[PDB]
Structure formats: structure tokens, C-alpha cells
Design an enzyme around this catalytic site. Structure first.
Site, PDB file in Angstrom:
ATOM      1  N   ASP B  25       0.774  -1.221   0.000  1.00 35.13           N
ATOM      2  CA  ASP B  25       0.000   0.000   0.000  1.00 35.13           C
ATOM      3  C   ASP B  25       0.811   1.280   0.000  1.00 35.13           C
ATOM      4  OD1 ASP B  25      -2.090   1.820   0.421  1.00 35.13           O
ATOM      5  OD2 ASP B  25      -2.631   0.923   2.332  1.00 35.13           O
ATOM      6  N   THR B  26       0.830   1.898  -1.165  1.00 34.71           N
ATOM      7  CA  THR B  26       1.553   3.174  -1.236  1.00 34.71           C
ATOM      8  C   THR B  26       0.911   4.374  -0.600  1.00 34.71           C
ATOM      9  OG1 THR B  26       0.651   3.796  -3.366  1.00 34.71           O
ATOM     10  CG2 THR B  26       2.647   2.449  -3.367  1.00 34.71           C
ATOM     11  N   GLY B  27      -0.365   4.216  -0.258  1.00 34.93           N
ATOM     12  CA  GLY B  27      -1.061   5.280   0.491  1.00 34.93           C
ATOM     13  C   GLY B  27      -1.100   5.201   2.039  1.00 34.93           C
TER      14      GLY B  27
HETATM   15  C1  LIG Z   1      -9.773   4.854   0.514  1.00 32.74           C
HETATM   16  C2  LIG Z   1     -10.740   3.660   0.613  1.00 32.74           C
HETATM   17  C3  LIG Z   1     -11.682   3.643  -0.599  1.00 32.74           C
HETATM   18  C4  LIG Z   1      -9.999   2.318   0.777  1.00 32.74           C
HETATM   19  N1  LIG Z   1     -10.953   1.198   0.867  1.00 32.74           N
HETATM   20  C5  LIG Z   1     -10.875   0.100   0.131  1.00 32.74           C
HETATM   21  O1  LIG Z   1     -10.086   0.009  -0.787  1.00 32.74           O
HETATM   22  N2  LIG Z   1     -11.705  -0.912   0.453  1.00 32.74           N
HETATM   23  C6  LIG Z   1     -12.658  -0.831   1.566  1.00 32.74           C
HETATM   24  C7  LIG Z   1     -11.660  -2.157  -0.319  1.00 32.74           C
HETATM   25  C8  LIG Z   1     -10.977  -3.304   0.396  1.00 32.74           C
HETATM   26  C9  LIG Z   1     -11.720  -4.182   1.186  1.00 32.74           C
HETATM   27  C10 LIG Z   1     -11.048  -5.265   1.751  1.00 32.74           C
HETATM   28  C11 LIG Z   1      -9.674  -5.428   1.523  1.00 32.74           C
HETATM   29  C12 LIG Z   1      -9.034  -4.481   0.737  1.00 32.74           C
HETATM   30  N3  LIG Z   1      -9.667  -3.447   0.186  1.00 32.74           N
HETATM   31  C13 LIG Z   1      -9.077   2.312   1.996  1.00 32.74           C
HETATM   32  O2  LIG Z   1      -9.348   2.920   3.019  1.00 32.74           O
HETATM   33  N4  LIG Z   1      -7.980   1.553   1.878  1.00 32.74           N
HETATM   34  C14 LIG Z   1      -7.050   1.245   3.002  1.00 32.74           C
HETATM   35  C15 LIG Z   1      -7.016  -0.282   3.181  1.00 32.74           C
HETATM   36  C16 LIG Z   1      -8.188  -0.849   3.910  1.00 32.74           C
HETATM   37  C17 LIG Z   1      -9.180  -1.538   3.219  1.00 32.74           C
HETATM   38  C18 LIG Z   1     -10.284  -2.042   3.915  1.00 32.74           C
HETATM   39  C19 LIG Z   1     -10.383  -1.868   5.293  1.00 32.74           C
HETATM   40  C20 LIG Z   1      -9.364  -1.185   5.974  1.00 32.74           C
HETATM   41  C21 LIG Z   1      -8.268  -0.669   5.282  1.00 32.74           C
HETATM   42  C22 LIG Z   1      -5.632   1.707   2.654  1.00 32.74           C
HETATM   43  O3  LIG Z   1      -4.810   1.425   3.777  1.00 32.74           O
HETATM   44  C23 LIG Z   1      -5.486   3.148   2.091  1.00 32.74           C
HETATM   45  O4  LIG Z   1      -4.190   3.301   1.512  1.00 32.74           O
HETATM   46  C24 LIG Z   1      -5.736   4.298   3.083  1.00 32.74           C
HETATM   47  C25 LIG Z   1      -5.850   5.652   2.356  1.00 32.74           C
HETATM   48  C26 LIG Z   1      -5.938   6.855   3.283  1.00 32.74           C
HETATM   49  C27 LIG Z   1      -4.793   7.613   3.583  1.00 32.74           C
HETATM   50  C28 LIG Z   1      -4.876   8.689   4.481  1.00 32.74           C
HETATM   51  C29 LIG Z   1      -6.094   9.034   5.083  1.00 32.74           C
HETATM   52  C30 LIG Z   1      -7.241   8.299   4.775  1.00 32.74           C
HETATM   53  C31 LIG Z   1      -7.160   7.215   3.882  1.00 32.74           C
HETATM   54  N5  LIG Z   1      -4.698   4.405   4.127  1.00 32.74           N
HETATM   55  C32 LIG Z   1      -4.941   4.422   5.443  1.00 32.74           C
HETATM   56  O5  LIG Z   1      -6.056   4.284   5.904  1.00 32.74           O
HETATM   57  C33 LIG Z   1      -3.714   4.586   6.362  1.00 32.74           C
HETATM   58  N6  LIG Z   1      -3.624   5.922   6.924  1.00 32.74           N
HETATM   59  C34 LIG Z   1      -2.554   6.703   6.770  1.00 32.74           C
HETATM   60  O6  LIG Z   1      -1.540   6.305   6.216  1.00 32.74           O
HETATM   61  N7  LIG Z   1      -2.646   7.947   7.307  1.00 32.74           N
HETATM   62  C35 LIG Z   1      -3.865   8.413   7.986  1.00 32.74           C
HETATM   63  C36 LIG Z   1      -1.534   8.911   7.175  1.00 32.74           C
HETATM   64  C37 LIG Z   1      -1.641   9.708   5.895  1.00 32.74           C
HETATM   65  C38 LIG Z   1      -2.202  10.987   5.906  1.00 32.74           C
HETATM   66  C39 LIG Z   1      -2.305  11.689   4.705  1.00 32.74           C
HETATM   67  C40 LIG Z   1      -1.852  11.081   3.534  1.00 32.74           C
HETATM   68  C41 LIG Z   1      -1.312   9.793   3.618  1.00 32.74           C
HETATM   69  N8  LIG Z   1      -1.192   9.115   4.770  1.00 32.74           N
HETATM   70  C42 LIG Z   1      -3.700   3.517   7.478  1.00 32.74           C
HETATM   71  C43 LIG Z   1      -3.760   2.099   6.886  1.00 32.74           C
HETATM   72  C44 LIG Z   1      -2.454   3.621   8.354  1.00 32.74           C
END
Ligand SMILES: CC(C)[C@H](NC(=O)N(C)Cc1ccccn1)C(=O)N[C@@H](Cc1ccccc1)[C@H](O)[C@H](O)[C@H](Cc1ccccc1)NC(=O)[C@@H](NC(=O)N(C)Cc1ccccn1)C(C)C
Lengths: 99, 99
Positions: B25-27
Site C-alpha cells: 500500500d503506497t497510500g
Molecule cells: C480509501 C478507501 C476507498 C480504501 N478502501 C478500500 O479500498 N476498500 C474498503 C476495499 C478493500 C476491502 C477489503 C480489503 C481491501 N480493500 C481504503 O481505506 N484503503 C485502506 C485499506 C483498507 C481496506 C479495507 C479496510 C481497511 C483498510 C488503505 O490502507 C489506504 O491506503 C488508506 C488511504 C488513506 C490515507 C490517508 C487518510 C485516509 C485514507 N490508508 C490508510 O487508511 C492509512 N492511513 C494513513 O496512512 N494515514 C492516515 C496517514 C496519511 C495521511 C495523509 C496522507 C497519507 N497518509 C492507514 C492504513 C495507516
């Protein structure tokens, strides 16, 4: 380009005639942008991730340009912390992961 | 290897001598793993995502091996649906985004 990951992979996109920054996110299935008005009809949707679910507006067949590459696809708009480009549009511009 | 993004980028990781699957995960800034009981000291922590925050435990200096490549760093453990490999470990394996 070849982007390394020592920093967040934020780029500039153009959408609606606006310039924005967005995160290139291989861990997202979909593209989620911050609240804006786009022209078009939309449908309510829910999407989830860490922390839970949010409500978003779904817009289909939207033109977006990511680093000068065109993509045409579905965009969700809603109260995301950050503009996210997910795999639906990353595949259109030929994005891969390499190591 | 080159990973395309038609499907979610799930790969095998080895951690504690056990194999798991995880999302590249690059995000994600951080690495977040499903609940498990690592030896070691931990710190409590909160991390956020699209829908809000969750509570996790922070372990430092963990060795993970990702598709044969070793990386050592901080891992967060908690009630995630999916194991997430974030930029803190991705950089160590020489991983890039290309288009
Ligand atoms: C954006 C959204 C549509 C996406 N959902 C998604 O793709 N889903 C629900 C499908 C799915 C279901 C089952 C299995 C896999 N995928 C998502 O949240 N993806 C998460 C992975 C995930 C999937 C399902 C349940 C739980 C998690 C993925 O980790 C994303 O990269 C997400 C993007 C993001 C970044 C910043 C703020 C909000 C969202 N990162 C995160 O949630 C990470 N946070 C993070 O890095 N933060 C808050 C710091 C930050 C701030 C600003 C910019 C970047 N990073 C955490 C995993 C640590």
C-alpha cells in the site's frame, strides 16, 4: 515517472478544470476526492476503510488528468481526509509497482 | 518483480516465521497487521483512516520478509480486516511506482 516512496506519493491532478493534489494509492480500490461540485448527476454511495464508513457522492465517466495522463472513470466525492487516486484510475494510466 | 494493479496487490509475507498475506500500500504511511501476539514491548497508539481512528499496539524493530526481501521496522497491530504493508517498509525493499 518513477516515483519512490520516501515521501507520500502526492501528485497534481486536473479535474473539472481545477487543479488538485492527490495521493497515488495502490491500497485503494476506488478514487475518493474531497467535497466539490462536479457537473453531472450523482448517486449516494457508501465506502469504507480504517475507522469505518463514509457517505459519498458517486460520479461516473469523469475525465481526470493525472500528471498529464488522461483517465476516464468513476469518482467518489465526500469527506475524505485526503484526495485519493485508487486502482480504478491507476490501471488506466499504466501504473505498476516495481521492486 | 512487477505488480500490476488489476487486482489488489496482495503478496506473501513472512513474519515470526509464519506466512501471511498482505496488501502493498503506497497510500499508508505505516504498516498495520492483524491481531497477533508478538513478544516484545509495545506502545499504545491511534491511527486514522477514511472513516475515523482505531486503536493499535506499536512494536518497533520487527523483521518482515516481503517476497524474499527483508525489511525491519515499526509495525502496528490491531483489529484490521487486512494486513497492510506501508511506506515505511516499502522503501526498504526498493519499491517504486511506475508509469
Ligand atoms: C480509501 C478507501 C476507498 C480504501 N478502501 C478500500 O479500498 N476498500 C474498503 C476495499 C478493500 C476491502 C477489503 C480489503 C481491501 N480493500 C481504503 O481505506 N484503503 C485502506 C485499506 C483498507 C481496506 C479495507 C479496510 C481497511 C483498510 C488503505 O490502507 C489506504 O491506503 C488508506 C488511504 C488513506 C490515507 C490517508 C487518510 C485516509 C485514507 N490508508 C490508510 O487508511 C492509512 N492511513 C494513513 O496512512 N494515514 C492516515 C496517514 C496519511 C495521511 C495523509 C496522507 C497519507 N497518509 C492507514 C492504513 C495507516
Amino acid at each position: 515517472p518513477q516515483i519512490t516512496l520516501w515521501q507520500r506519493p502526492l501528485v497534481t491532478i486536473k479535474i473539472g478544470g481545477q487543479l488538485k493534489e492527490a495521493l497515488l494509492d495502490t491500497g485503494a480500490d476506488d478514487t475518493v476526492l474531497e467535497e466539490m461540485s462536479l457537473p453531472g448527476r450523482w448517486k449516494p454511495k457508501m465506502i469504507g476503510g480504517i475507522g469505518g464508513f463514509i457517505k459519498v457522492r458517486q460520479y461516473d465517466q469523469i475525465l481526470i488528468e493525472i500528471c498529464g495522463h488522461k483517465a476516464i472513470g468513476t469518482v467518489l466525492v465526500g469527506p475524505t481526509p485526503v484526495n485519493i487516486i485508487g486502482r480504478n484510475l491507476l490501471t488506466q494510466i499504466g501504473c505498476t509497482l516495481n521492486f
